[PDB]
Amino acid sequence: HMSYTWTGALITPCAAEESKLPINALSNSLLRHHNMVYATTSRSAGLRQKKVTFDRLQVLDDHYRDVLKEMKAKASTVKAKLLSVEEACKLTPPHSAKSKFGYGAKDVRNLSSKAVNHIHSVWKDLLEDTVTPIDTTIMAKNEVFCVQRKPARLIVFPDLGVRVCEKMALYDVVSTLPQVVMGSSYGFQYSPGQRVEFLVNTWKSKKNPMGFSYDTRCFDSTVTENDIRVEESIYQCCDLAPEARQAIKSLTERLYIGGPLTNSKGQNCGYRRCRASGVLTTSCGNTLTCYLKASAACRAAKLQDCTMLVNGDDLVVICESAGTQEDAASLRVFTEAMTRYSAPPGDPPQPEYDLELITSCSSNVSVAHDASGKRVYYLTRDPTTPLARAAWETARHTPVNSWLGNIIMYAPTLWARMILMTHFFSILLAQEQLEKALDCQIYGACYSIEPLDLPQIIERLHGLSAFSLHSYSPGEINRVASCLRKLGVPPLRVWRHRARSVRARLLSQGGRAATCGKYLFNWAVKTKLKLTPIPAASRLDLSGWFVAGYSGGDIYH
Numbered sequence: 188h189m190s191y192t193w194t195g196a197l198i199t200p201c202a203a204e205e206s207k208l209p210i211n212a213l214s215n216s217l218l219r220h221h222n223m224v225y226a227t228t229s230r231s232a233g234l235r236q237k238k239v240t241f242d243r244l245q246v247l248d249d250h251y252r253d254v255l256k257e258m259k260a261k262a263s264t265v266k267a268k269l270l271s272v273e274e275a276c277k278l279t280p281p282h283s284a285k286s287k288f289g290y291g292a293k294d295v296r297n298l299s300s301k302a303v304n305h306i307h308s309v310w311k312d313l314l315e316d317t318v319t320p321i322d323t324t325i326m327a328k329n330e331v332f333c334v335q336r337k338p339a340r341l342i343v344f345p346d347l348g349v350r351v352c353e354k355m356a357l358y359d360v361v362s363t364l365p366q367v368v369m370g371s372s373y374g375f376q377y378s379p380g381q382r383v384e385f386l387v388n389t390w391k392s393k394k395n396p397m398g399f400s401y402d403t404r405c406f407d408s409t410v411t412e413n414d415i416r417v418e419e420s421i422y423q424c425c426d427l428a429p430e431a432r433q434a435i436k437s438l439t440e441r442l443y444i445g446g447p448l449t450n451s452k453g454q455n456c457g458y459r460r461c462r463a464s465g466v467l468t469t470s471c472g473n474t475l476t477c478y479l480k481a482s483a484a485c486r487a488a489k490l491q492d493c494t495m496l497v498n499g500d501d502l503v504v505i506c507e508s509a510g511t512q513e514d515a516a517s518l519r520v521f522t523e524a525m526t527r528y529s530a531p532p533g534d535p536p537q538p539e540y541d542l543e544l545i546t547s548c549s550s551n552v553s554v555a556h557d558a559s560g561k562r563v564y565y566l567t568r569d570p571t572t573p574l575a576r577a578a579w580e581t582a583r584h585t586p587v588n589s590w591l592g593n594i595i596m597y598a599p600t601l602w603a604r605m606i607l608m609t610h611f612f613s614i615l616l617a618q619e620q621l622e623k624a625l626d627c628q629i630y631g632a633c634y635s636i637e638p639l640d641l642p643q644i645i646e647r648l649h650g651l652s653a654f655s656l657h658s659y660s661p662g663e664i665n666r667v668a669s670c671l672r673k674l675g676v677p678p679l680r681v682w683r684h685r686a687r688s689v690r691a692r693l694l695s696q697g698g699r700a701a702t703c704g705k706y707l708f709n710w711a712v713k714t715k716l717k718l719t720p721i722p723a724a725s726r727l728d729l730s731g732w733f734v735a736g737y738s739g740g741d742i743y744h
């Protein structure tokens with residue numbers, strides 16, 4: 188029961204790959220330790236192949252079937268709709284990988300007769316054939332990190348025509364089913380502020396709280412045929428149109444369970460028998476499976492009052508403590524149950540008795556103070572990877588602007604405000620590109636956003652307090668200052684000086700640029716301006732922002 192089998196053919200790139208941090212005239216103003224930053228390339232794909240390839244053994248007990256029965260009872264209350272070709276076309280990212288059959292993402296988005304006719308023939312084939320394995324492309328992802336080198340992560344995806352069909356059959360399912368099945372445990376329904384609120388309220392709801400994050404080693408590879416069939420039985424609980432049922436069965440049999448792996452040059456690389464990382468159901472499938480195995484493992488370990496928080500393969504459990512030493516033994520049993528369910532740990536989970544010490548989705552809760560001096564909880568993270576990616580983005584245009592996604596998601600943080608906002612607004616001002624829409628990712632979905640709209644976006648997600656936070660915690664300040672010394676990033680005092688200039692330059696432009704100066708950089712001036720609700724923020728359509736996760740799902744909003 189191997190996750191993969193391989194032919195020996197290489198995982199090949201599509202274009203030139205850079206591993207060394209590109210340098211330009213702007214680089215040194217952000218980061219001096221250039222050799223610390225690198226990008227993964229297809230050169231390390233062979234090492235990743237070794238890591239992801241293993242035998243999976245699964246032992247399913249009564250706790251597993253009991254949780255699954257409860258999940259199916261909730262899933263049966265869901266009604267989902269089939270999307271039209273046209274509706275599914277419009278969810279396609281403008282730079283999504285082109286089809287092998289003579290059309291691309293822009294042809295799909297424009298509803299070109301050629302794209303639409305091929306999609307209809309792919310759909311008809313799904314309904315008529317529920318056996319033939321569907322082809323997939325295997326690629327090495329090019330991602331930027333700081334040293335201490337990771338081999339490239341792999342991406343496995345079917346053709347563009349298949350991806351549009353996945354949307355038609357399952358978009359409504361993967362967007363609505365997880366919150367119904369998992370309720371408040373479904374992480375992707377929350378904005379960062381709502382996630383903090385859920386974590387704080389959960390922690391407070393326990394008499395003697397204990398919390399831990401559970402890291403599964405190579406989660407996609409641990410996903411078995413059983414897991415993928417169990418996910419399909421959950422989707423099948425929904426009230427569906429007859430064509431959607433048939434398409435879901437077909438996609439499960441032909442694509443989700445497994446299939447051949449083809450490199451960018453058209454050679455057969457091998458065969459997958461685990462989760463494909465680049466399908467519509469990757470996020471929903473991972474969330475459901477992680478929640479199922481973990482809820483079952485909690486009952487096996489006799490963990491009292493376990494509240495889960497699940498986002499794909501990312502898991503946080505908050506429960507009642509049985510005493511520090513009993514909690515450590517309880518965690519070893521939870522781990523043994525997860526292992527029998529084919530979800531062994533990367534790092535062994537550690538019990539935590541301080542909410543701020545739990546790391547989940549690379550993040551943690553911290554505390555600052557608003558303008559009135561009131562304690563305010565917010566989400567932060569170690570800024571090393573955001574800063575390594577900002578350095579890359581300073582010298583190269585990339586398909587996804589991580590700095591923009593990081594400013595959006597981490598707007599209240601000391602590091603996003605003082606460094607990311609300051610640096611990138613300075614760059615945009617110099618290029619007169621404040622109005623230019625840029626692509627970013629929020630919970631795996633793609634968005635096109637104008638930097639000029641950041642004050643309204645931030646107000647809507649985090650509230651006006653995101654522009655007034657001060658008196659950050661010593662632990663947070665120390666982590667940021669340490670990260671800056673390690674990367675050779677100028678100290679926070681330099682950023683304050685630069686921000687005063689960026690603020691003045693923005694205010695000088697007037698209009699929307701002045702609003703950016705006023706709201707984003709009020710922290711930089713000694714005599715602070717009174718920050719009132721931005722009229723434009725109320726008009727924002729932010730409906731599908733925090734509904735579901737779509738990592739690898741090829742979604743554009």
Ligand SMILES: COc1c(-c2cc3ccc(NS(C)(=O)=O)cc3c(=O)o2)cc(-c2ccc[nH]c2=O)cc1C(C)(C)C
Pocket residue numbers: 374375378379382469470473474498499500501547548550566592593596597628629630631736737738
């Ligand atoms: C939910 O966790 C997040 C996540 C977050 C966490 C996460 C954890 C696990 C997975 N796993 S998977 C591939 O199986 O779906 C997928 C995801 C995912 O898509 O988004 C992502 C961000 C984020 C940061 C910067 C730009 N864009 C973003 O989406 C912020 C938060 C916080 C903790 C701040 C709410």
